[PDB]
Amino acid sequence: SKKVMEHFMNPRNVGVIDDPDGYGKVGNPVCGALMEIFIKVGDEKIEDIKFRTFGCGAAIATSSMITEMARGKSLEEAMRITRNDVADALDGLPPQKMACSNLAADALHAAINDYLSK
Amino acid sequence: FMNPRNVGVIDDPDGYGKVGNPVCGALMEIFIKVGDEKIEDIKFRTFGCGAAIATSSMITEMARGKSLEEAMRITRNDVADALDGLPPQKMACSNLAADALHAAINDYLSKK
Numbered sequence A: 001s002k003k004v005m006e007h008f009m010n011p012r013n014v015g016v017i018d019d020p021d022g023y024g025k026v027g028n029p030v031c032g033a034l035m036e037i038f039i040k041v042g043d044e045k046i047e048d049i050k051f052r053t054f055g056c057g058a059a060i061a062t063s064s065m066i067t068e069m070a071r072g073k074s075l076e077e078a079m080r081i082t083r084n085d086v087a088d089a090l091d092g093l094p095p096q097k098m099a100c101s102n103l104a105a106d107a108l109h110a111a112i113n114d115y116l117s118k
Numbered sequence B: 001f002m003n004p005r006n007v008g009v010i011d012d013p014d015g016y017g018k019v020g021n022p023v024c025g026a027l028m029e030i031f032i033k034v035g036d037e038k039i040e041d042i043k044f045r046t047f048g049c050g051a052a053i054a055t056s057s058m059i060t061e062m063a064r065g066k067s068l069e070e071a072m073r074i075t076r077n078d079v080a081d082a083l084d085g086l087p088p089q090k091m092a093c094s095n096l097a098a099d100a101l102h103a104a105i106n107d108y109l110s111k112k
């Protein structure tokens, strides 16, 4: 796919935030991967966001798209971003386990929840 | 040393093979250029795991410079000493390379 390949080749928001407002980490040995999302929160919105993957990189395209979508959104709006709406925003995705498909959205939700704990 | 060998893409390849890991979703693609009925150049591209990548690096290195006939005979078994006790989850990852190599050779053979 031109667009999915764009996100695999040139992923948006890869990295770490050193003092993050919220941090989520999820992984699953069936998917061969762990991933982390870091958020900074300003006002009531996602002011900055970064992700990184460890292991298999098959979740990179979805993670890049989800993080772009979450940037600038209210926490409440970002909590509503799902794999299914990221899937539509990539115009689908190749065959994979649903658990593997959900990693990025699950890490994003974890990071938001982490912030809320504070 | 640490960088896997033969990584990349070939534009307008003589043969192209792609196979997928249906679990994590990663793809393995192999590109071949053939001169004198030998594999003159070969590259792989994947976003998969270390087992996918390490195997692909070995299989593509083995295929380089070989006749198409010889390359078609390369199996995961030819690098089994480097893959001892690999966990069951990773077996499919290690089979991508040889499967994609065979696809690429067959792709070339279908165009003449």
Ligand code: FES
Residues within 6 Å of the ligand: A030, A031, A032, A033, A056, A057, A058, B021, B024, B025, B026, B047, B048, B049, B050, B051, B052, B090, B093
């Ligand atoms: S290629 Fe994804 S876990 Fe091996």
